[PDB]
């Protein structure tokens, strides 16, 4: 039974222009990268949960003068879809809105419940996650820029020791059983994977074929790294390090290739 | 912070021929990946520790007409060097001596001193670490035939956390600050990686020619995985699984090419 | 005897730093250290232990409009462990406050009662002398070179064994220093970096074997300047040095031929 | 002037055949270093001692399947001549009786007495000694043959410290006033020296010739060492390790030459 | 856990002329033959110490119509540099001086602190010694003539029973992990062996040659003994008694030998 | 703020001095005079203002048998008036006090409630800087070159008006040093004497413009030791020396072509 308390970065804000209503949401279980980078890790090694405490804190990073507004929700059942229209976030259990440039909490209920850990993705999210958070921003006269960043404060309870959970995530990973660093999304001869979190990984692309797929591409800033690239028998081995939440990795195979493999190494 | 208890397997025992003795030992200390397997991992999340509980079990695995004799004993000195001696040894603060079919116990003392975990080899181990253990084996019929393990018994609290430590192992770390998962051994162009403990591991190989070194091989019983070689560009993935300590990994070079370089990851 | 000081001292001048890539900067919680303890350093020299009991890191803003970024100060009492590199990194560490720009805020360091050694030199067991280390970072402003606010440490210490009067120059022992920590190197090859921690006047002297030894060295940063006393013939240089901010750098090279060369540091 | 608790090797225990006992016997002394390899030293300083626990214990570390008894006994009159007999031997004061693959302990009780102890040969025994211990075996089914080992366990306390007494043999001692490190054995022209107990020494074997005697030899599984030799002024000086009682040095020399002169100090 | 209480000799005082200040350090820690002729060789039986009470005595021996004076001095950290002037020697943590024919005590403070016993010269002073002691003399009107002694009482406590440290110092003893029983000056072909102590010792010289190095010499009063000498493989036996501090082995090679070998035992 | 400071140290170390013709020996009263106060000069460093509220000297006999001689110490307030060069000069001093070789005495220097300025460099007004003058006498001894006694210094300061850190290195300001008096000088012509004014760790550096110069540098005192480092190229001398009593002295004599050599004292 080990009991920790800490104030972890979870997310970068970033402001929303125009009409059409914005959301990010979360979910809420130890074994969820994004949310807990390092609880996460020591989650690996435990059965079972129960959450103490919990407070997410919006934390301002701009000016006085910074239009725009912040709104934070959280849902009981993380098996419910997140809202897509305003109206729905609003009918959520618990929200709170604030000033781009004003600090605010959203401390977020608890059951006393002691739940397990999921361990893959056929588990019943009813009765192995805690919940769903949900961002929302408008207001901004300014595109994709940052206004601050929200932490997450917690309590938790780890207990039930148990065999370490896996570490790597692999292209061929059967009911993810393993951790879900990355996330991929093709468009014809174009992968892409996308890097959940910040942190430093290592990701290893291999092929089939020779000439399978050109040296791969660094998106977004606030990712570098070193790409170790060899085109006989495709392979690429990029250590990097991702300062920010969904940087990305770009790969383009021949239509000669088949879908390309890759796994990832928490560095 | 919070205490966490459990027995892992530590190291798996075979016979010593002769009437002089053979030893073993190791450094307790909860980064140390070959007594703490698993717990290794945790610790690297604090900054100090408190060791309340700890005993080593030897368990016999052999036929009853096995001669020889099995000891253990302890130091908490870590600094001073291993017993040399079969007197030396029986002179150590603690000890327990037994036959090979039958199952004993050490039970280490504790101080209740509270330590800052070692971050680096040029921490003092007076200072770090918890102590030394040391196995001694002789009188056996034949050499080396495996008679038992030895599984080892703790309950300690970790404490002040902090930011993660590195994970992974390089061929270039700074006085030992990543862990010890590999330990390199050359004799001319022919190189070695001693597999430390059991486990899931992903090593990568690198070179800097084209026949720079040839697939590589594995040696031991009890480790398998895939090479993945290529020779353009020296390089090898080898995705590992060791149900052993002290297993295998042998690559070698050509004359011509520089010392290589080397990474391995837990899988 | 024993004696219980308390002051309030400027620590640093806060830059902006562009993007979301973070800028960090660290200093090592010690008595001796110049860096934090500009004049204690002095009466420091003169005791053998010392006990902090109240320790405080405070940032006050120099701007109030339309200007952006994040300021984040944290601790870490294991101050032999590396400084972070990671956003992640900084955030997971024992202790640790954020706010904006224009907004001050203080960090309050926690106490132990324990009463240590001063660190007498650079090869002193860190996890046995030091304190603690401090660390900021800043990123996402707009503006690249602009002083946005101040830091301040405000402490009360005891100092309490009394000796003779510490070394009060620092000398290259063959691989590590002497004194007080005036100065860390850092060898690149055939490349020698001197990295100055704190603002002052100070005298450095570097020497060699063979009379080609090295190349006048040269000043690194925006706020060092000084003059460089340089004679090729021995191989030897003097530098009457002016740090106006923390970290400033000399840089030498020297010949593949030369041995790695020796130097001193004076406090003016 | 304070107690000491400590857990010392003995001596190996090797088979016997036949229906016949065969004897082995120790005379309880601080100052004996074949009963107290460690604590002898220790001894060195003290006027006084007084025996507060006692118990010696056979550890097998032989198969099940060898036939033999093995048995301990004791006895508080040290000056009293040992036994001969089966009889004679289990009609000690206490004694204890046990197979070779079966551990047994034999705890030697206490008499509160307080005692000198011994400088030299020619104290008397009722006076300075605390008994003698015997070890009888018999039934066995090989000769010399290793079957387990004796480790005794005490608890005394010194007191009434002094003038540290003499560390170094001669082969020319005031009746037994130096440790008795070595035992001199002579035939003719053959001279050995049997060690009497598993240690570091080094040993130093004087002529007065040319040829007095040649290099000397090291006889006994588990001793070794150098032996540098120098015929001219016939000197020897051995620097030995032994693992194990009763190891020997074999020294041969000339008709001609005088009987050799040795010290033995330790290392 | 032994408690020893005694008052041994610690060093000779003689006078010292002049007006350039003289100094003489030591430092204090069981291992220190210097320190602790006896108790240095019970500490090799164990890990830990702890001090109880610490005075050094100045006694006289004389007469009042001898002009001089005598000062002693403590200093917490062995780490820092004995004093290099009378200004130092003053600023220290404790001093005290008298005059020549008077006796005085220095009662060093004690704290709590139990320490490890000092295993090799890779400690930490700070972490493993107890501080340093400081004696100065002037004032005097004839050279090198002792006035007095000075004697250590103490009451310290010995615990953690472990293995016996090395007994006998060598030519080639890496880490000094064994005691410091003599330290080594070279002047071109030209030993100096200077005995630290004093006692009863055994140094063994050795050569490569023949010619190797010249019989040995003894300097100093207050040192006598046996040289047993041998050209051919130049090997020389001496068994001395060093009767006062600093004693001195000269020993000559020729430039054809290479740098001689010895070992040192304890008598 | 302020503090206030207590403690003995020593002085120094008495030799006997033969014959009628006394011999003399003095010191300046300035908290930043490191002859007097070996540590307090550190942390005098930090303050404009002083205090001195208590001052004795005391003289206390390593000798018992056989050993004549006079010791005698006088005080002057008027720090800047010569020092006595006759026994009766001494003697008409305002406050003295005499004693035998073996017999211990001491000298309370009488104090006035005066809170003045420290001392900032060699050209201030004694008259307002500094708190008088300590003078030594010894003649009368038959044995020349012994140690008789010892001199100690017991005070109690005041020290009050707090700014930035001092100078901590003297250089010659052309004709006049420029920070603490770590040096005095004296030209003769051609030749130019250092006199180290207490013992202790020191580095002096010594520089010139024709390349002749100046000669190497000597060592002139029974107790001065060092290294070194002449370049006779640009007339240059590095030494790190090591006094072990007041008063030793540096020797230099320069080409009478060369212009007057300047020079910098570090403290080590
Ligand atoms: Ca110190
Ligand atoms: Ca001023």
Same mark, same amino acid.
């Given at each position: 039974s080990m009991t920790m308390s800490k104030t972890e970065l979870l997310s970068t804000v970033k402001g929303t222009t125009g009409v059409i209503p914005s959301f990010e949401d979360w979910v809420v279980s130890p074994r969820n990268v994004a949310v807990f980078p390092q609880l996460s890790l020591l989650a690996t090694n435990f059965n079972k949960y129960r959450i103490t405490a919990l407070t997410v804190k919006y934390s301002p990073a701009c000016s006085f003068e910074t239009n725009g507004r912040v709104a934070l929700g959280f849902n009981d059942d993380a098996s419910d879809t997140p809202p897509t229209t305003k109206v729905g976030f609003y009918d959520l259990g618990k929200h709170v809105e604030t000033a781009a440039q004003t600090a605010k909490d959203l401390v977020i209920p608890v059951d006393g419940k002691t739940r397990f850990i999921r361990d !893959? #993705? !056929? $588990?019943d999210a009813k009765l192995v996650d805690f919940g769903r958070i949900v961002l929302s921003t408008y207001?901004? $006269?300014? #595109? $994709?820029?940052?206004v601050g960043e929200l932490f997450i404060q917690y309590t938790i309870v780890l207990s039930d020791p148990t065999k370490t959970a896996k570490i790597s995530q692999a292209s061929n990973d059967k009911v993810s059983d393993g951790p879900t660093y990355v996330v991929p999304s093709v468009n014809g001869n174009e992968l892409q994977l996308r890097v959940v979190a910040a942190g430093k990984w290592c990701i290893i692309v291999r092929g089939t074929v020779e000439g399978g797929f050109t040296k791969p591409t660094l998106i977004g800033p606030g990712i570098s790294g070193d790409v170790d690239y060899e085109s006989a028998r495709p392979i690429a081995v990029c250590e990097l390090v991702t300062q920010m939440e969904g940087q990305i990795l770009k790969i383009t195979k021949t239509s000669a290739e088949q879908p390309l493999q890759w796994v990832v190494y928490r560095m």
């Open positions: !893959s #993705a !056929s $588990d207001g901004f $006269d300014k #595109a $994709d820029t940052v």
